Amino acid sequence: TSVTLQLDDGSGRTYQLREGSNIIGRGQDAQFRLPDTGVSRRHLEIRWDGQVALLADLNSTNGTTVNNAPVQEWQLADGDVIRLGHSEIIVRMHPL
């Protein structure tokens, strides 16, 4: 299975998940950096093990929603919409 995050801001920016920890946030150390000033420096983590993508909010200032519902941890699926700050990320999860 391959998993790509698609930033839905017009930029066409994407990030393919690595196995293990993927940090999304505004910080320089994030694997996928969003400059959105409402995004925490370490905002969320997605753990990928080749089968399951498990999102966790990292005690973020503004929270994380999946498909418009606030979440702490969430098992992601193809097409899920993650909202953080004013940004939206579409999950693209496709079996080979």
Binding site: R26, G27, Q28, T37, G38, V39, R41, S60, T61, N62
Partner: peptide
């Protein structure tokens, strides 16, 4: 990489 703005 300022403090996050609260929404």
């Amino acid at each position: 990489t300022a403090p996050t703005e609260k929404i």
